[PDB]
């Protein structure tokens, strides 16, 4: 394809491309609200967190660090931050 | 000759030359 | 300045006894007259008294060791083997 529009790529290929190789760099990670059952406060957690995030009001772990993304403990709820 | 055997022959000749010169 | 190119401690033997014999005795004499770190007090004051006897100046500890080195690799492997056989013998 000699006439690919490099200026305006559609979001499908814009997302399939590597983070650095996009037209403008965009991280693949995000921030999430996490709810621990039996607790009221809301924890802001990085999606690719490298540390065990703990609640200050309960001796419970929220996420476990993995290779790519922090695995949330079962029973915990989460939502995105502003897409 | 094979190049390896020319190399061996030259090494023998060089040892003989060194021995002759050292004798002097 | 550097006083000898290669003889080092066997420069006291002059031209005698042969270069290979002097080279052979060089490392043995260096290890013989070296001061080793004492494993009891931690000081570098463990030196040979007689053949096989190594005394520390500070803690006055005397150890049975090698002829020219504080310990021999043979004895080290022996100690490790005896420890392994003891821990295998008991449970």
């Amino acid at each position: 394809p000699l006439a690919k529009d490099l200026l305006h790529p559609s979001p499908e290929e814009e997302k399939r491309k590597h983070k650095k190789k996009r037209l403008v760099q965009s991280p693949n990670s995000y921030f999430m609200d996490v709810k621990c059952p039996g607790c009221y406060k809301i924890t802001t957690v990085f999606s690719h967190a490298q540390t065990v995030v703990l609640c200050v009001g309960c001796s419970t772990v929220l996420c476990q660090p993995t290779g790519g993304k922090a695995r949330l403990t079962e029973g915990c709820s989460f939502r995105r931050k502003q897409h | 000759m094979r190049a390896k055997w020319r190399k061996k022959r030259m090494r023998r000749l060089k040892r003989k030359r060194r021995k002759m010169r050292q004798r002097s | 300045a550097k006083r000898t190119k290669k003889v080092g401690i066997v420069g006291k033997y002059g031209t005698r006894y042969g270069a290979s014999l002097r080279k052979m005795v060089k490392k043995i004499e260096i290890s013989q007259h070296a001061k080793y770190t004492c494993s009891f007090c931690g000081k570098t004051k463990m030196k040979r008294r007689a053949v096989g006897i190594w005394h520390c100046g500070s803690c006055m500890k005397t150890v049975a060791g090698g002829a020219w080195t504080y310990n021999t690799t043979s004895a080290v492997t022996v100690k490790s083997a005896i420890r392994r056989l003891k821990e295998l013998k008991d449970q």
């Binding site: - | - | 770190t37 494993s39 007090c41 931690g42």
Partner: protein
Amino acid sequence: KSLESINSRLQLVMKSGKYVLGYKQTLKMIRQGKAKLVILANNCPALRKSEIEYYAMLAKTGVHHYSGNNIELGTACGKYYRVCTLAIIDPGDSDIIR
């Protein structure tokens, strides 16, 4: 992990907490009752180790047997001399839990 963790915690006791290095000062601090942790190299003489353990039992203070020697404990303290016995007056870094 334990050895590197205790080395790092000792490094942070240095430069941030009050300590004292050596047998005589360690005994003096223990009998003043303000030594909260006493670290002993495994190189320590057996009599000295036993006596410091008895002093610590009397003073109700903890004793940690460092897995090094006096040279390595000096290095862990960051000094260029051998230390065989040391005491911590106050950690300042959660080496000693409140």
